[PDB]
């Protein structure tokens, strides 16, 4: 669908049988997920954000489903504040920037 | 224009009379620049990502153009690295994002 951006973009996210919501995000590279129960199998890693570094677990070929979207891919969980899902995942949706 | 996210979405901005590239942010609610030389008074504000929160200066009415395309809103500059184009500009400029 087309999200006008007057208003955070939220979808809706099943992962691992739980139902959370996201924000559908363009600057961020990788899928970052606030702490979750997810059956691994992860090692490691931290990224960048605004103003610091976050030590995060890298998890694999995670099925993720997005709105009506199958998709599946890397996904890290991590002391995020928020749910985003960056263009690792946004490449599979076939997401789009338009202006 | 219409980009897919196969790397960055990175566009100039002529901001200040300086050229720049900055990120399209659909996740950032205000655009954080790098720090520059911008004329104007400003306020104090502190700002939280992933890894923390940044204390940035605040200007307001400010003239960026964004492709060939002019906004004027609050720019918030400090510290990080990517100078992200968030939100309230991206509203003016009319993005959209699809999928
Ligand atoms: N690799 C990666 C994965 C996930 C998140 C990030 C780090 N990010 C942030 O810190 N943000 C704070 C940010 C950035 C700009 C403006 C604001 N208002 C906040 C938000 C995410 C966010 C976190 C918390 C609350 C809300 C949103 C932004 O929407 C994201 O695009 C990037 C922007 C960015 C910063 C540094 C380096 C690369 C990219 C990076």
Same sequence: chains 1, 2.
């Avoid at 006008?4 to 590279?29: F, H, M, N, Y």
């Avoid at 993720?64 to 891919?73: D, F, L, N, Q």
Wanted: aromatic letters at 6%.
């Amino acid at each position: 669908p087309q999200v006008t951006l007057w208003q955070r973009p939220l979808v809706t996210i099943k992962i691992g049988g739980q139902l959370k919501e996201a924000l559908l995000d363009t600057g961020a590279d990788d899928t970052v997920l606030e702490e979750m129960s997810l059956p691994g199998r992860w090692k490691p890693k931290m990224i960048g954000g605004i103003g610091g570094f976050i030590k995060v677990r890298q998890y694999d070929q995670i099925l993720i489903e997005i709105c009506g979207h199958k998709a599946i891919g890397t996904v890290l969980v991590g002391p995020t504040p928020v749910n985003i899902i960056g263009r690792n995942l946004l490449t599979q949706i076939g997401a789009t920037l338009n202006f």
